């Protein structure tokens, strides 16, 4: 609660979010983004949670073109509970509030969606999100210039046998 936003859309569906605080601001952002891109965020959250193989099997790929199972191993490793907790604990009050608002705003859209702008309505992977999910996405981007470029290589790293 204590979440409120004023949203104006101009030409081409560009939102202009006005709020009195970070949680309200995040609320407006999450709602507006969900209207245009709920399915996209849901997919990328599945990726960052390492749940691609769970929903889609091992034959598919992520939008980064990694195989589902190797992608899942990498993201489960990257986004372990301990890492997410430490990340969360290091966040400023303002950032925590932005993220809390965002999750609530996205979830509000999901509750009310009738399919007008959402093609994945009814899919089991289109689900309410949590602030941890937003941290998973943040960390996925954080390592795009680092260990993320070696995701396949990390998965493939196994000690030698008797050769």
């Amino acid at each position: 609660t204590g979440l409120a936003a004023d949203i104006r859309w101009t030409a081409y569906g560009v939102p202009h979010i006005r709020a009195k605080d970070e949680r309200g601001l995040g609320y407006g952002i999450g709602y507006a983004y969900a209207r245009d891109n709920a399915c996209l965020l849901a997919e990328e959250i599945v990726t960052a949670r390492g749940e691609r193989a769970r929903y889609f099997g091992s034959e598919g790929k992520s939008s980064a073109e990694l195989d589902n199972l190797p992608s899942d191993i990498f993201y489960a490793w990257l986004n372990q509970p301990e890492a997410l907790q430490a990340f969360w604990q290091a966040q400023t009050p303002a950032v925590r509030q932005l993220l809390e608002g965002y999750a609530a705003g996205f979830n509000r859209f999901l509750r009310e969606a009738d399919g007008k702008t959402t093609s994945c309505l009814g899919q089991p992977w289109l689900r309410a999100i949590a602030t941890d999910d937003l941290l998973r996405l943040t960390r996925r981007l954080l390592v795009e210039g680092g260990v993320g470029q070696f995701a396949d290589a990390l998965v493939a790293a196994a000690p030698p046998g008797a050769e």
Partner: protein, 546 residues
Amino acid sequence: SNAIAVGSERSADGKGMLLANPHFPWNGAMRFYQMHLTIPGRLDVMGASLPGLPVVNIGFSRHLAWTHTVDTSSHFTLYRLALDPKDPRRYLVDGRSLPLEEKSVAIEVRGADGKLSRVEHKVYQSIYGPLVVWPGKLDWNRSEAYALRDANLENTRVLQQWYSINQASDVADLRRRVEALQGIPWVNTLAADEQGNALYMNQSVVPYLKPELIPACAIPQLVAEGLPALQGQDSRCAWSRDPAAAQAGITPAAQLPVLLRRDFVQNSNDSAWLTNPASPLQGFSPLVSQEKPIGPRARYALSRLQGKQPLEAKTLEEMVTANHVFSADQVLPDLLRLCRDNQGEKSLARACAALAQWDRGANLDSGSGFVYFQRFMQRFAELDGAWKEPFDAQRPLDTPQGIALDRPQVATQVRQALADAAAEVEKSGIPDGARWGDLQVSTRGQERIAIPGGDGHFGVYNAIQSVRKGDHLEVVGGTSYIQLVTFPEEGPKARGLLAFSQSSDPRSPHYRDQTELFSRQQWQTLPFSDRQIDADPQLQRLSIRE
């Protein structure tokens, strides 16, 4: 990505100007999204962000505009491990054998039967980070293995960093806010303000090694090819500590390249070196910035930016919308000369005709000459010593240039390259008289939209990356969020587009509306002031609470 910031000494109005032309994917976790954020009295910022982020990543405010490009700095180091000769799951640091740590993750997998089965996977870790294997290059044998230390894993400041940037007043404030927090993971920052300051910052999270440690700590064979690799058997090759750095082991802000000028700064994914050739940035760690030959995009930009004539907003817009294939400038004059030298050669006739008629562009109506040129360049790149003028460090903006046709071996190899390129083009199913826009498209539902631009490696400022899919080249990345900002008295004037449109969902009214506009290269106002927003006849409003 491209970025150009113009200051008071070069702008037509004596104020700041910024062109932001990031090159990012058209789908997925890095798909830009436009938004304007306001907490009245203390935050008012507009631009674009990435999926799931509640802050603007590239944008503008009352007195400031900023953007980002991917930098050439290292944001991790590999560590070559010396394995314990008695145990390949142990490794040596200062001659002492340490055990690898094992972290298992469990993944659920949906089978053909629709049921879930559990897969357990072991991730081996050293003191530096996880082990990585690139078969045939970075192996894990009985002698050596490789671990990877990612500097951004400890960067918990990233979200706060962009929220802070969103609150920045001018260029000086922006610089203070970024240098103070050091939360930018892997991009340069370029900015301009109303007062006419132009800023470049190579201010990101970069592993720190003191200068004297590099020669002994580098892996010689791996650094030649630009992999940041260090000796993992020596404790002295740990990242250096400096209390001034925001994060232990990263490079302090004062040691990273910055250029603050009143003429211009630019970057097209090369190092800091030639941000502005009048003031080269040199003497930095190899992990930070090196004096490497610039790409054709930067070479193109500098060709348009240098000199003393004022720069107008129109000039910067047209640097994008011209779709000039700048790599043609170095090669095509001499390639056409070879064509005239080989008249009556049946294998070269179609190629040489297409090339001579070609407008040297990646426009929608651009002729098949572009396709011939691309296939030739892919082969020309593999040839040795074919440049008439090789890269000259003393002339880094004007070299390499021309084909060494006076050299008989080069003449034979270049002609063969063109024959082979022509054979490939003609082998593929390309209709007679077809244009570039007939080939390169973005799919929207069952429809296609023609997309102008070409690969940045050919020096097209409007960089577009596409992949063959059926009968077409499908756009996957490149020009994305475009913003061009000036500062007239009334308030910031922003113009641009989101090339792929706001919504990735085919059902949305905003799935292809800006993509139609991008095809026609018709940029639009990005409304920021209450007046601009209220003037829009499409204005809609919703207030929500819970």
